[PDB]
Paper text:
GH144 protein from [name] (XcSGL) was also used (Section 4). Because hydrolytic activities toward β‐1,2‐glucans were detected for PgSGL1, PgSGL2, PgSGL3, EeSGL1, SkSGLc, and XcSGL, the general properties of these enzymes were investigated using β‐1,2‐glucan alditols (see Section 4 for details) as substrates. While many of the enzymes showed optimal pH values around neutral pH, the optimal pH values of PgSGL3 and XcSGL were 8.5 and 5.0, respectively, which suggests that the optimal pH value varied within the SGL clan. XcSGL can be regarded as an SGL because of its narrow specificity for β‐1,2‐glucans and a similar level of specific activity toward β‐1,2‐glucans as the other SGLs. Comparison of spatial positions of predicted acidic catalytic residues suggested that Groups 1–3 and GH144 had the same reaction mechanism.
β‐1,2‐Glucans are natural glucose polymers produced by bacteria and play important physiological roles, including as symbiotic or pathogenic factors and in osmoregulation. Overall, phylogenetic, biochemical, and structural analyses revealed that Groups 1–3 are new GH families, GH192, GH193, and GH194, respectively, and that the three families belong to clan GH‐S (clan GH, classification based on structural similarity) as GH144 and GH162.
Author numbering: 55 to 496
The structure:
């Protein structure tokens, strides 16, 4: 199905987000903007993937993108590293999730050294490694620094419980007691750990990652799949990795793949909004999509003569696990699933843009979220009230923006996937996890 012109505008504004809102002195992209409290290393991951999308669509010159990319990779290479409570950006090749926008160190002491967030960064880093393949000495320098940053990550260090990778680490309390367990958006964590030639993990790590899959497998809204409620779980890893046809052991046994798993998640989200058992306002066949993102406030209000819990930033979803629902829809959820179900995502995007766009579609594309049900006369943590038209976010969230841009690019010409199909570490990672068939086939 071809894309209407609206999608080329969405692609562009969302690229422009990462180009503009990033600090150019160090290449740190904000967690959110315009609030701009601090940077996220996961923002940076999506930024590095964004810049070459801009080159190919002519929104930025190759030379600007190189200069920006080099600034970014050199910032991380040269950042102070160490176990100390202040003054460091990272440790053991990992980095703090959140760094100060100007000085680049751990924002504050509540900030963890993050495995999944380092992971997301590294996806962008390896993207730069496989994209900037020219004989420019700058592109060569990009390849080498990227290579160095990936090799320094000590995945093994974070294996506290057996082959399973911990979520992170604090100077003040030691390892985080939670582990990355399936199913969710962390497939690419274990891929990166499996593909490492310096500090790599064993195939075992994947096996046990999959042990908890069977808590999530079942039937929701007419579909049989791994039913993690938050849409993004089905998107982040799929940004860089093409999951069509290739099958690991679990999917070989189920007889599907992770691409079909995302597609099933997306139709189910849609059918959830059609049934709309919670009877949230405007939920319907072309107004849907629940995932982690902003909302109006931590509160309880009466809605249709019942008491309903409402959150600001929170996991939101539609599925058998982690399925909180406020009435707030995040555009990234439907849009970033363009590649999985374009026959429903296209009219969804058009419908939300038409109905809501005079307040929802702003300078850098879709704002993070909106809630047509929320018209209470109360203080907000963020966003704003539009009279008799509900609530809308005031911030964009980079990790919500990143997949909007990258998944539209993958729809148009499979650009992001094709670049990563050239990275030796991603391939190795997948092969060592047990993946076979499709493009992995020799
Ligand atoms: O309380 C932490 C600080 O949160 C700040 O709020 C920011 C907000 O952070 C979210 C966080 O979003 C990140 C998320 O991935 C993180 C990961 O969450 C995973 C989840 O893990 C749970 C743990 O977080 C939790 O401690 C334990 C408690 O028992 O339960 C775990 O299940 O598990 C699901 C699977 O079921 C995963 O899908 C989910 O990703 O938690 C890790 C451990 O800390 C983090 O390292 C990891 O970053 O998603 C992306 C990565 O895909 C990441 O960029 C997000 O930032 O999610 C948790 C759990 O949902 C929230 O509690 C937390 O509020 O992130 C947004 C966007 O970046 C940012 O705008 C917010 O500012 C507060 O500001 C801080 O004050 C607070 O200390």
């Amino acid at each position: 199905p071809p894309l209407p012109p609206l999608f080329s505008d969405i692609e562009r504004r969302t690229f422009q987000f990462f180009w503009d809102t990033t600090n150019e002195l160090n290449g740190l992209s904000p967690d959110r903007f315009p609030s701009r409290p601090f940077a996220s290393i996961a923002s940076v991951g999506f930024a590095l993937t964004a810049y070459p999308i801009g080159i190919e669509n002519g929104w930025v010159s190759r030379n600007q993108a190189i200069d920006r990319t080099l600034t970014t990779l050199k910032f991380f290479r040269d950042a102070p590293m160490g176990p100390q409570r202040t003054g460091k950006a990272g440790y053991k090749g990992f980095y703090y999730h959140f760094l100060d926008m100007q000085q680049g160190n751990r924002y504050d002491s509540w900030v963890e050294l993050s495995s999944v967030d380092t992971a997301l960064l590294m996806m962008g880093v390896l993207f730069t490694q496989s994209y900037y393949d020219g004989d420019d000495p700058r592109e060569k320098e990009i390849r080498q620094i990227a290579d160095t940053l990936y090799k320094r990550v000590d995945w093994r260090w974070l294996q506290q419980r057996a082959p399973l990778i911990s979520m992170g680490w604090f100077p003040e309390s030691g390892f985080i007691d939670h582990d990355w367990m399936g199913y969710n958006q962390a497939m690419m964590l274990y891929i990166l750990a499996l593909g490492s030639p310096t500090h790599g993990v064993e195939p075992d790590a994947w096996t046990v990652w999959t042990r908890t899959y069977n808590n999530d497998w079942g039937v929701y809204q007419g579909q049989e799949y791994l039913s993690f409620g938050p849409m993004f779980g089905h998107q982040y890893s799929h940004v860089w990795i093409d999951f069509r046809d290739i099958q690991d052991q679990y999917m070989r046994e189920r007889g599907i793949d992770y691409f079909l798993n995302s597609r099933r998640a997306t139709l189910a989200q849609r059918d959830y909004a059609i049934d709309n058992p919670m009877k949230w306002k405007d939920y319907g066949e072309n107004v849907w999509g629940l995932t982690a993102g902003d909302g109006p406030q931590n509160t309880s209000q009466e809605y249709r003569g019942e008491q309903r819990q409402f959150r600001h930033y929170s996991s939101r979803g539609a599925g058998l696990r982690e399925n909180f629902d406020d009435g707030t829809i995040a555009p990234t959820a439907a849009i970033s699933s363009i590649v999985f179900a374009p026959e429903v995502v296209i009219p969804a995007t058009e419908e939300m843009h038409k109905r809501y766009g005079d307040f929802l579609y702003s300078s850098y594309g879709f704002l993070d979220s909106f809630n047509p049900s929320f018209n209470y006369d109360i203080p907000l943590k963020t966003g704003r009230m539009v009279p008799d038209r509900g609530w809308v976010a005031s911030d964009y969230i980079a990790i919500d923006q990143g997949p909007i841009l990258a998944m539209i690019a993958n729809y148009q010409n499979e650009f992001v996937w094709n670049v990563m199909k050239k990275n030796a570490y991603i391939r190795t990672g997948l092969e060592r996890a047990g993946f076979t068939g499709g493009w992995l086939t020799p």
